[PDB]
Amino acid sequence: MLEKFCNSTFWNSSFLDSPEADLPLCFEQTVLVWIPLGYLWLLAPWQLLHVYKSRTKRSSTTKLYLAKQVFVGFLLILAAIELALVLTVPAVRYTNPSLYLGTWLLVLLIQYSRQWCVQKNSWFLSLFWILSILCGTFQFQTLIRTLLQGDNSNLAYSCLFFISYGFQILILIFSAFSENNESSNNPSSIASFLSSITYSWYDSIILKGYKRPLTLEDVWEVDEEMKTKTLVSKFETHMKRELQKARRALQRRQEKSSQDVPKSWLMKALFKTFYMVLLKSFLLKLVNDIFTFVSPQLLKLLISFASDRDTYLWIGYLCAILLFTAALIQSFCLQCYFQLCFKLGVKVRTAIMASVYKKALTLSNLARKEYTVGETVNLMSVDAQKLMDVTNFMHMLWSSVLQIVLSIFFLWRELGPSVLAGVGVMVLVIPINAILSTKSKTIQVKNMKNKDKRLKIMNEILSGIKILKYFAWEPSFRDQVQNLRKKELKNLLAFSQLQCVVIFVFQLTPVLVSVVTFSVYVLVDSNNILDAQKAFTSITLFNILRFPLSMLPMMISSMLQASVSTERLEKYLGGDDLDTSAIRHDCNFDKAMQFSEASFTWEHDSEATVRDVNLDIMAGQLVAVIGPVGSGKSSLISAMLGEMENVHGHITIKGTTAYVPQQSWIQNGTIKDNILFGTEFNEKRYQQVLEACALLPDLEMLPGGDLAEIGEKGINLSGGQKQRISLARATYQNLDIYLLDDPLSAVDAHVGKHIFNKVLGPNGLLKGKTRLLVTHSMHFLPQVDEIVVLGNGTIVEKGSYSALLAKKGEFAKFSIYLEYLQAIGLFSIFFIILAFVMNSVAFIGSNLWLSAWTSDSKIFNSTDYPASQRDMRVGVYGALGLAQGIFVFIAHFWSAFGFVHASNILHKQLLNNILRAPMRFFDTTPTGRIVNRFAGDISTVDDTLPQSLRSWITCFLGIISTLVMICMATPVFTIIVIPLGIIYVSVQMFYVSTSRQLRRLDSVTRSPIYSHFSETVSGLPVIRAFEHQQRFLKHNEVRIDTNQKCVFSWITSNRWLAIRLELVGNLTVFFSALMMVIYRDTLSGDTVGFVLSNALNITQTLNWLVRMTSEIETNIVAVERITEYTKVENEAPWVTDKRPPPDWPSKGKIQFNNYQVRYRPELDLVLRGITCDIGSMEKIGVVGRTGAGKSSLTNCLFRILEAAGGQIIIDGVDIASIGLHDLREKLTIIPQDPILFSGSLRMNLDPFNNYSDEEIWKALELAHLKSFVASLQLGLSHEVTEAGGNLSIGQRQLLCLGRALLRKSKILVLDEATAAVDLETDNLIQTTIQNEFAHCTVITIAHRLHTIMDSDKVMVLDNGKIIECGSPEELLQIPGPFYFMAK
């Protein structure tokens, strides 16, 4: 290019050889300057028309806009001035000021233009500053040196340029800041560029979640573009276009076949709609992958630079700077790709998840019947979520190929054909990783059966805990479950070990691959000598090639799963839409309801369920339809709703329609929500229906009658109750036509009468509403306007009740972690940690040997390399290719035994503690939490936690190995770590304190989407009747969107951490490399290799140490919950040293002494000084009012409730001094509720197998249950289902009687044994009790008095006191409470 234009030298390569080297000034003022100025005038208009083409409301002139404006003005003054000195000479000397004059004017114009838009400091302007400082600094330093060197000939130019440069820095710093607009809820459209690429605008949420826990309202609205209303609209148009084009394709195929479902269209549709956001990434992965290969190729310069003491310093420093800048651009250009490629994740899930719903309301029933509710919901729960994950890394279907192919090429140059073996090992490890993953999968699945078996046994145990306590059977199940758990563990060990090898064969690959490649290359040709450049630019490349070649087998799974999951979706959205041509809604024709010789069928190609139906009804006619089953009673109403397919003839109606189903559909929420059904609250109407529906009293006993969580998961109502609610909903809405479906199905006759004459009848709410009622009840026909009896296909009678039908009636805290570690055993944790440390020491040891190996090339090369030296250096590196192998395999493996054993203690603690807890524990807390807490956590502490803990320690020592390795060369770096360490720790302390929350908010707000869809598809037919469809769509969007604002704010939070680590992972590779350049003298060329080649991987590892630390910090909450219960208090010891005589009790005499007891210390005394003496063989009945303390007395006899006062003595021995078991085995009780345990019938009778079958069979004979068991196919081995669901209530009670007769205790307590047993069985129970237990003390509690007249004495309990006690005859004579009850 021209040089006379500057009258100097453009290129003088001699200027780049001396240590003091600077670029030629002419080139420095003519090419560098043309970049930014060329940058503007080339992209000025687009960023100008794009501003005026779309016009926004001009905003206020904030303080910054003035400062950002005036500063550019000052540049114009300086730019104008420097033209004055020049004019008051080289051509370049005067044109350059002119160029700035024009440009400064323009940049002023734009900077005012941006004010209108929302994103004030966009990328275009903000980059021009950064690109006009890098291309400006070179000029800055040249002037500094020349001024310093003492020229002072161009000082006039220098001063003006200095200020011009200084202001340029100032403007940029202001550019990054963004004005806080009025609301702009999401700070994603107002954040300035430099704040929207380092995600510094998310700083608000993170420090907000550190003190005050987050909530749905504290997360910014999603956006104005990702709103599901927009996405559904956009995707719908493309979806419709492709489908119709796809439909045409099928027609040609079937036409050709003449001479199936339209497939392979969905994936095409998504492309045609998102090709902006798909393309802004493909042009952004390259810019990230290309910069992934500048970190290694620059490291070669420093190694090469340090290896020669006659290399100019500015080569090293410029390399150190680029090694930082070339890693910042990758960092920014990568995160800016994840956010831009995860956005495509949710933005595609919503486009489908929210678009499946809109098709659910339209799918023709003929196709809907193919599905079920359970699978349809999954169609957007797991089937439509695989589209997220595939879209989350769809771009790694070629980036991996590029990274692998390109990386192999770079490696090939440095090493040569030897590298083929190095890449070979990675190829070889792929299948090894694959095979074990499956073999682990089968074992995991094979274990699920055992897990289900344990829960089924346990879920029943907790409910049947009461009887468990009476007979002290606990140890039998303790062993019964312990054996089951032990069987599970033997399977578990295999699973953990198989996972150990997977970690081992992956954590060891980088160590082994180097050994193979650094052996073949130095073993093939004696000439080859490993040089520092050749090694540490290869060891680093493998760590870059490892990820793509170690994930490609995994990704292929996702991209193959999505090809079947997506296949289902097309088969769904492509379903034929329901046709409404058979029904026409209009008010023009006078009649209300009209039929035209129509016919309907439940199945398209089979018999017609409705034949030549011609019904014509006018407004206000209460018409009823009756007939037998199969004539089509329910079909007509179904036909009207349009949920049926006609054969011919049209049926048209007038006005709106209301419908009531025979099978009730109840929307989740409250009674008000269900009845109101999306309309305002009219108290007059609302109360009218409540009374007219008889629900006003039905809301009394309900805990939340006015507002209760009716529906699934909250409440269960009677069959009529839900029917009552449904008809209330139709009545309140006050529509034109009303269609009923047998409201008299499951309601009281009087109640049915009430509603009929209060709602349906002429006096009812709907006096003149066209009403159609279908049912089989003949009661209410006389009050009906017309009764069209439905014959077998058509009608028979067209008239009123008395018109024709009446003739004849003939068809009418860290402390937790220690607790977990305490379980795993401090002995093995010591060696587990130690083995890892010896592994790291070998790793740092391995690198040091490599350094002392490459050093040989300085000496040997021109001189031949002795075989002895070659065979040695290779050998040692091999002996350290195993020292790292052994100290890992013997490290992770010894851990697997540790973790499994820990899972064997925690589980053992619960059973040996929960079963010892008092009944108070189980009553207060719900049975659900115990099952869940002992289903997930106990499953979490063995299935996932150990897999996570091991990966944490192996990465922490990974970081320490690097930092110790860096410091070993340059001791000064120990200073730099303290700032970086604080920065990193202070980051983890924030991110993990929030990313844990925002994941909870995601799950808590995801379930409603599915629950809502399930409760819509189930209740679809009702919705179409009321035509409330549009209400639901707008009600599903506002619920699906409430999720995006949670997932999205999680992705960004997961992104704001990546930048502040990759910046820490660069401040540690930059400050490390810089110290190498400063300390040229003391560090040989090779030593810079391992120090700086390993530091390049610290950036990635610093993520895993934080990513995992989130899982551990959250997963371990599981073991904390388990820890809570094992520390719960427990009842008294089962066995005490003061054992009674083996024959005790001998007589059965029971004595009470001012006994007092209470359910809880906080509650009032329930027994208030009971004092009585029960003689041997005394049959006592206990009577009283409910809650008087009858039941509490029984619980005390077995010491279930500890004595608050007094005492109880049996056969002269105070039971409070005996162990509970020793007491309980000698007492027999027949519980009110005969609960049974799943398993063999023999087990239920005897859990310890302490009795022979002959004894069992006799006991059954006395229980009168022998015959039934003998009839059972397996006899004693018959399997009783859960809670004995397969046995009648009487049978279970008789079975319980069998238990009692077998035990043969001197004392027997009866607790309402015949309350729910038929008289015939009660006599059987009474007879055997009288005969079999004629020698044992009996205490009988029963609401049936007649069962107590036979007692020797009767005890009257009222309000916790004994009012009367005497024989039944004496008490009857005295006119007391017992006399009143008997009367």
From Swiss-Prot:
<keyword id="KW-0547">Nucleotide-binding</keyword>
<feature type="topological domain" description="Extracellular">
    <location>
        <begin position="291"/>
        <end position="316"/>
    </location>
</feature>
<keyword id="KW-0067">ATP-binding</keyword>
<dbReference type="Pfam" id="PF00664">
    <property type="entry name" value="ABC_membrane"/>
</dbReference>
<dbReference type="Pfam" id="PF00005">
    <property type="entry name" value="ABC_tran"/>
</dbReference>
<dbReference type="InterPro" id="IPR011527">
    <property type="entry name" value="ABC1_TM_dom"/>
</dbReference>
<keyword id="KW-0813">Transport</keyword>
<dbReference type="GO" id="GO:1990962">
    <property type="term" value="P:xenobiotic transport across blood-brain barrier"/>
</dbReference>
<feature type="binding site">
    <location>
        <begin position="1184"/>
        <end position="1191"/>
    </location>
    <ligand>
        <name>ATP 2</name>
    </ligand>
</feature>
<keyword id="KW-1133">Transmembrane helix</keyword>
<feature type="glycosylation site" description="N-linked (GlcNAc...) asparagine">
    <location>
        <position position="861"/>
    </location>
</feature>
<feature type="topological domain" description="Cytoplasmic">
    <location>
        <begin position="565"/>
        <end position="821"/>
    </location>
</feature>
<feature type="transmembrane region" description="Helical; Name=12">
    <location>
        <begin position="822"/>
        <end position="842"/>
    </location>
</feature>
<dbReference type="GO" id="GO:0015431">
    <property type="term" value="F:ABC-type glutathione S-conjugate transporter activity"/>
</dbReference>
<dbReference type="GO" id="GO:0150104">
    <property type="term" value="P:transport across blood-brain barrier"/>
</dbReference>
<dbReference type="GO" id="GO:0008559">
    <property type="term" value="F:ABC-type xenobiotic transporter activity"/>
</dbReference>
<dbReference type="GO" id="GO:0055085">
    <property type="term" value="P:transmembrane transport"/>
</dbReference>
<dbReference type="GO" id="GO:0015723">
    <property type="term" value="P:bilirubin transport"/>
</dbReference>
<feature type="transmembrane region" description="Helical; Name=11">
    <location>
        <begin position="544"/>
        <end position="564"/>
    </location>
</feature>
<dbReference type="InterPro" id="IPR036640">
    <property type="entry name" value="ABC1_TM_sf"/>
</dbReference>
<dbReference type="GO" id="GO:0071716">
    <property type="term" value="P:leukotriene transport"/>
</dbReference>
<keyword id="KW-0597">Phosphoprotein</keyword>
<dbReference type="GO" id="GO:0042626">
    <property type="term" value="F:ATPase-coupled transmembrane transporter activity"/>
</dbReference>
<feature type="topological domain" description="Cytoplasmic">
    <location>
        <begin position="180"/>
        <end position="269"/>
    </location>
</feature>
<dbReference type="GO" id="GO:0043225">
    <property type="term" value="F:ATPase-coupled inorganic anion transmembrane transporter activity"/>
</dbReference>
<feature type="transmembrane region" description="Helical; Name=4">
    <location>
        <begin position="120"/>
        <end position="140"/>
    </location>
</feature>
<keyword id="KW-0472">Membrane</keyword>
<feature type="topological domain" description="Extracellular">
    <location>
        <begin position="415"/>
        <end position="417"/>
    </location>
</feature>
<keyword id="KW-0325">Glycoprotein</keyword>
<feature type="topological domain" description="Extracellular">
    <location>
        <begin position="141"/>
        <end position="158"/>
    </location>
</feature>
<dbReference type="GO" id="GO:0015127">
    <property type="term" value="F:bilirubin transmembrane transporter activity"/>
</dbReference>
<dbReference type="GO" id="GO:0042910">
    <property type="term" value="F:xenobiotic transmembrane transporter activity"/>
</dbReference>
<dbReference type="InterPro" id="IPR005292">
    <property type="entry name" value="MRP"/>
</dbReference>
<keyword id="KW-0677">Repeat</keyword>
<dbReference type="GO" id="GO:0006855">
    <property type="term" value="P:xenobiotic transmembrane transport"/>
</dbReference>
<feature type="binding site">
    <location>
        <begin position="627"/>
        <end position="634"/>
    </location>
    <ligand>
        <name>ATP 1</name>
    </ligand>
</feature>
<dbReference type="GO" id="GO:0006805">
    <property type="term" value="P:xenobiotic metabolic process"/>
</dbReference>
<feature type="transmembrane region" description="Helical; Name=6">
    <location>
        <begin position="270"/>
        <end position="290"/>
    </location>
</feature>
<dbReference type="GO" id="GO:0008514">
    <property type="term" value="F:organic anion transmembrane transporter activity"/>
</dbReference>
<feature type="topological domain" description="Extracellular">
    <location>
        <begin position="1"/>
        <end position="27"/>
    </location>
</feature>
<feature type="modified residue" description="Phosphoserine">
    <location>
        <position position="1288"/>
    </location>
</feature>
<feature type="transmembrane region" description="Helical; Name=15">
    <location>
        <begin position="970"/>
        <end position="990"/>
    </location>
</feature>
